[PDB]
From a paper:
SARS-CoV-2 utilizes a trimeric spike glycoprotein for attachment to the host cell receptor angiotensin-converting enzyme 2 (ACE2) and for the subsequent cell entry step which involves the fusion of host cell and viral membranes. Given its crucial role in the viral replicative cycle, the spike protein represents an important therapeutic target and is a critical antigen in host immune responses. Given the rapidly changing mutational and antigenic landscape of the SARS-CoV-2 spike protein, a structural understanding of spike protein mutational effects and the discovery of broadly neutralizing epitopes is of importance.
To identify structural mutational impacts on ACE2 binding we next determined the cryo-EM structures of variant spike-ACE2 complexes. The resulting maps were obtained at average resolutions of ~2.6–3 Å. All mutant spikes exhibited slightly higher affinities for immobilized dimeric Fc-ACE2 when compared to wild-type. We did not observe major differences in spike protein expression across the variants, and all mutant spikes tested demonstrated marginally enhanced ACE-2 binding potencies relative to wild-type. Superposition of local RBD-ACE2 complex models revealed no significant structural changes. These structural findings confirm that mutations outside of the RBD do not modulate the positioning of ACE2-contacting residues at the receptor interface via allosteric mechanisms.
Author numbering:
A (entry chain B): 14 to 69, 77 to 145, 153 to 176, 185 to 247, 257 to 298
B (entry chain A): 299 to 620, 641 to 675, 691 to 694
C (entry chain B): 943 to 1041
D (entry chain B): 745 to 827, 856 to 892
E (entry chain C): 745 to 793
F (entry chain C): 992 to 1041
G (entry chain C): 398 to 446
């Protein structure tokens, strides 16, 4: 089942500053009181990060490229954002990745889904509406896990696909800032490594409608793109990354 | 010392002669806990099996497949593996496992093999010649045979061409053996291709029903996730052993650690990018890896004109890992320590000198 | 920065040791920098070539390290000879030498 | 610990012996340098218990009895302000003995001037 | 300017860094030598007319 | 072939840097002597013979 | 060392080869010196039956 959403309001997407966010742990190695230089796919400091809104009537579900990797930030309250779609053609011709977080658990499936034009979940004012795909014929990977999840919650994710491994990095931050990204540093812990082994060039954000037509809950998300670069990470006495330096940002940091 | 200096006479002094290394004694191979087993109960111990024309294909991924449970079972009559040996299945890792399940006759078990010819191979289930996997078959006269006759298992008897490898044909279209059109009705020269198996408990062993599960192992360019159970040797501490933790190997002394790792981190590195801390995969505890005690071996001797007595210094090695005297420079064997102070004759180090009067330090 | 000369010598020695240890991580054109990986992954006819590449790279690194150690030893020996001269002429006597 | 690597390494000859010999020469040279700089007196001179030097105060350079290291306040400040087959050999002269040599030189130059450097 | 040559050169590690650091040390040493030899006075004196 | 060129050029550069370091040590010794002559012969009168 | 082998197995009589008769019939060392000689003997070492 698919439903077209025809009540959207036309608006260009916004842009804002990345500040010093998007740093993740590059590996699984404990390091203490050391300065480590690593060359990896990172998000540049103070970069131009695209800003999308969900407010009522804004419902931002565009088609975005994936490129080398995607940093996804979420200023979220009341749990509207539910998952992501990854793939190349987003249909039954190729194989696509589904990540959803419903009321009970987090489900990851790699199947040839015949996706809808507007995939979504729904909350009735309980969850009784799910319109993401119409079919699933060839499934290779399934993974059921625990639930991962004024704006009160900040969700940072980093999605990378190298050597048939999909690395998802996550960080949950309690915030009290009303509209934009708070300025500070928080290193993203690695959340999961999946051996999906599929080609990914495009991704989709999954949202949830509110029914009492439909109403969009207040949420905002940010999309940034990773580039190959070098960072200097500082490890404290407890092994937690507390500060970082972008090696190619300015001559002082260089 | 004479061999090192290439002379039969050695002058008074200290001479570096050898290198002392501790030899590894045991091998410690700790990998993660053998949890999250693959669902083999729903394939082998199924209450009902599929027909050979419509054989069930269950795909197994993201778990641990313990093949020793299947191999050591006495309930299986055939465990013939093609392309791989059963002994190394429990060690190797594969991307996906295909479990094909069906029921055939006793005489038809031989046809589930590469290069065979018959009704089952040509028309029901075809295996490739370059097949990697195992064919497991067992007698099921107890479950799949009833006194009235169990006709719940159909096979394809006729097709114009042989099946491709790993093909399923569930078509119920009338086979045309003659020039005349069948027109969808089973008359003369036109037969229905699916025929039922007659399974009675009083039949012979070549006609009794046999449940066959074929496991297909393939390697694709994706990272392999169906791995075998990794046998873990018990942990031994305070000795120079060869450690293999989650594929990271080395030699060292494993001692208790006070370093508090974060839950996602497994190994520890210093400034020089050498592994000095590690987390045990079986039990979540932190272990320090101290390198084994290696050092120089120096021979302290006076002139051979004076005496042939020698002492040995193990540099940077404590005396408990090899007239025993512990110095900051290392362990000194063969020289007695005195409390009197004299001028330095043979320099040892850290304020310690040696002389001959026996050899005193 | 009063004690820069001693800290400079300590930093140079530590940096040389760190560089020498760090050079083990380089494969020098071989498939891997780990000897165990080469010995466990390849047959001895090609493993001999890979080990030979690692040996020549590490030997070049060690010879380079010894060469700068000898040059620094010469510099420290000159400084020590100057220090001994100052100890003899300034502390154990009064020197008429200007500056 | 690779036997095959050592067997291949033996084809290159006595490079390892040359490197070890050079490092040994440097290591003995450092001790020789320390002997040349600090061990220039064969008598360990000591200061009188009464520090009556005609108004001259040498507390900052003489060894402090209160400190376990027997170093001067200046020497203590100096020590505070300085922060795979590799081994570090200890120096032949320890820090306390070098401090003792400096104390002997200070006692000689305070109580005897330049006379101790040229004889009795 | 060969990218393949630089990619192969990266396998050899930090030899280039050592050579550059040694040359930088020599270059600062020359300036230190000139400073020690000629800059022994902090007052610029002039002769009378 | 590029590896052969790299190792040859690297050996040449190491040889050049090593001989430059030796010459730098010699020039440093000469400069220290020159500074000593500047301090003792120009800024004062020296009793040292020759 | 004289023997008779197949036509495709003459490449395995060499130092550093991986093969079947190399492992279980006749092994040459890595530092082998000498010459391997092979010639066709279908006229002499073959029968129609
Ligand atoms: C929701 O809207 C999309 C886009 O308008 C529809 O997708 C189109 O479906 C028509 C079917 O007549 C195709 O001919 C078009 O090619 C589709 N567009 C694209 C870009 O592929 C979608 O069908 C609509 N959903 C429903 C349920 O009607
Ligand atoms: C010599 O100098 C020392 C240190 O400069 C003097 O010790 C000081 O004495 C005064 C008064 O007794 C104290 O307030 C200071 O704290 C002391 N300084 C230290 C570092 O302890 C000492 O009095 C001077 N005179 C003699 C004769 O020793
Ligand atoms: C971000 O990009 C948009 C258009 O791509 C541009 O108008 C805006 O000025 C950019 N912001 C910054 C900070 O570069
Ligand atoms: C969440 O999804 C899983 C898998 O599709 C399903 O088993 C579960 O019942 C779902 N929960 C809810 C509340 O829909
Ligand atoms: C994908 O599904 C289609 C129909 O569902 C099937 O014909 C095809 O063989 C499948 N491919 C794979 C690789 O499973
Ligand atoms: C992935 O998909 C893109 C676009 O469809 C294509 O250009 C690229 O070659 C694909 N890569 C692989 C490895 O299949
Ligand atoms: C590190 O952890 C200790 C407790 O284990 C704590 O006292 C200290 O403040 C922590 N340091 C930082 C920088 O968080
Ligand atoms: C299936 O049943 C047999 C017979 O009781 C039992 O021995 C075996 O453990 C069961 N499970 C598997 C995976 O074979
Ligand atoms: C591993 O299993 C053992 C029992 O076999 C248990 O005592 C231990 O707590 C387990 N460790 C983890 C990390 O689950």
């Amino acid at each position: 089942q698919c439903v077209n959403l025809t009540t959207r309001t036309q608006l260009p997407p916004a842009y804002t500053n990345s500040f010093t966010r998007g740093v993740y742990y590059p590996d699984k190695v404990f390091r203490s009181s050391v300065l480590h230089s690593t060359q990896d796919l990172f998000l540049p400091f103070f970069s131009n990060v695209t800003w999308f809104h969900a407010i009522h009537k804004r419902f931002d579900n565009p088609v975005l490229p994936f490129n080398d990797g995607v940093y996804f930030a979420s200023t979220e309250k009341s749990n509207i954002i539910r998952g992501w779609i990854f793939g190349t053609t987003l249909d039954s011709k190729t194989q696509s990745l589904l990540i959803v977080n419903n009321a009970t658990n987090v489900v990851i499936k790699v199947c040839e889904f015949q996706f809808c034009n507007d995939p979504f979940l729904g909350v009735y004012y309980m969850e009784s509406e799910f319109r993401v795909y119409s079919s699933a014929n060839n499934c290779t990977f399934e993974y059921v896990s625990q639930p991962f999840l004024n704006f009160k919650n900040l969700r940072e994710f980093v999605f990378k696909n190298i050597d048939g491994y999909f690395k998802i990095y996550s960080k949950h931050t309690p915030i009290n800032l009303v509209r934009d990204l708070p300025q500070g540093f928080s290193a993203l812990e690695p959340l999961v490594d999946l051996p999906i082994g599929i080609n990914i060039t495009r991704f989709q954000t999954l949202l949830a409608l509110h029914r009492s037509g439909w109403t969009a809950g207040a949420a905002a998300y940010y999309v940034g793109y990773l580039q190959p670069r070098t960072f200097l990470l500082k490890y404290n006495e407890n092994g937690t990354i507390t500060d970082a330096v972008d090696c190619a940002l300015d001559p002082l940091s260089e | 010392t004479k061999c090192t200096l290439k002379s039969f006479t050695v002058e008074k002094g200290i001479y570096q002669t050898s290198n002392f290394r501790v030899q590894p004694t045991e091998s410690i191979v700790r990998f993660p806990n053998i949890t999250n087993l693959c669902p083999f109960g729903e394939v082998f111990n199924a209450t009902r099996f599929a027909s050979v024309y419509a054989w069930n294909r269950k795909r197994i991924s993201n778990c641990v497949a313990d093949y020793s449970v299947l191999y050591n079972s006495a309930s299986f009559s055939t465990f013939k593996c093609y392309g791989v040996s059963p002994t190394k299945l429990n060690d190797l890792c594969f991307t996906n496992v295909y479990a094909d399940s069906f029921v055939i006759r006793g005489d038809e078990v031989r046809q589930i093999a590469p290069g065979q010819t018959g009704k089952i191979a040509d028309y029901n289930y075809k295996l490739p010649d370059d097949f990697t996997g195992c064919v497991i078959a067992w007698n099921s006269n107890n479950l799949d045979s009833k006194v009235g006759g169990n006709y719940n298992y159909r096979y394809r008897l006729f097709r114009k061409s042989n099946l491709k490898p790993f093909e399923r044909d569930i078509s119920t279209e009338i086979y045309q053996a003659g020039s005349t059109p069948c027109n969808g009705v089973e008359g003369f020269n036109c037969y229905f291709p699916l025929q039922s198996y007659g399974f009675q408990p009083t039949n012979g062993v070549g006609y009794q029903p046999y449940r066959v599960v074929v496991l297909s192992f393939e390697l694709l360019h994706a990272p392999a996730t169906v791995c075998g159970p990794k046998k873990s040797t018990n942990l031994v501490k305070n000795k120079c052993v060869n450690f293999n933790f989650n594929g990271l190997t080395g030699t060292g002394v494993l001692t208790e650690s006070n370093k508090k790792f974060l839950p996602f981190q497994q190994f520890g590195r210093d400034i020089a990018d050498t592994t000095d801390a590690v987390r045990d995969p079986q039990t979540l505890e932190i272990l320090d890896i101290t390198p084994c005690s290696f050092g120089g071996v120096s021979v302290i001797t006076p002139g051979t004109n004076t005496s042939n007595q020698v002492a040995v210094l193990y540099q940077g090695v404590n005396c408990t890992e090899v007239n025993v005297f512990q110095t900051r420079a290392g362990c000194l064997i063969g020289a007695e320590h005195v409390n009197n102070s004299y001028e330095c004759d043979i320099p040892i180090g850290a304020g310690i000198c040696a002389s001959y009067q026996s050899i005193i330090a | 920065s009063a004690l820069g000369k001693l800290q400079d010598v300590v930093n140079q020695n530590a940096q040389a040791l760190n560089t020498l240890v760090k050079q083990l991580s380089s494969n020098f054109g071989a498939i891997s920098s780990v000897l165990n990986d080469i010995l466990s992954r390849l047959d001895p006819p090609e493993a001999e070539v890979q080990i030979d590449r690692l040996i020549t790279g590490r030997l070049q690194s060690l010879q380079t390290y010894v060469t700068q150690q000898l040059i620094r030893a010469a510099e420290i020996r000159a400084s020590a000879n100057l220090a001994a001269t100052k100890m003899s002429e300034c502390v154990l006597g009064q020197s008429k030498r200007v500056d | 610990d690779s036997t095959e690597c050592s067997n291949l390494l033996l084809q290159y000859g006595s490079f390892c012996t040359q490197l070890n010999r050079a490092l040994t020469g440097i290591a003995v040279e450092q001790d020789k340098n320390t002997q040349e700089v600090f061990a220039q007196v064969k008598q360990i001179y000591k200061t009188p218990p009464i520090k009556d030097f005609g108004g001259f105060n040498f507390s900052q350079i003489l060894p402090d009895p209160s400190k376990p290291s027997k170093r001067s306040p200046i020497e203590d400040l100096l020590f505070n302000k300085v922060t795979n087959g590799l081994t570090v050999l200890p120096p032949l002269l320890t820090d306390e003995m070098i401090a003792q040599y400096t104390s002997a030189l200070l006692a000689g130059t305070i109580t005897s001037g330049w006379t101790f450097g040229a004889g009795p």
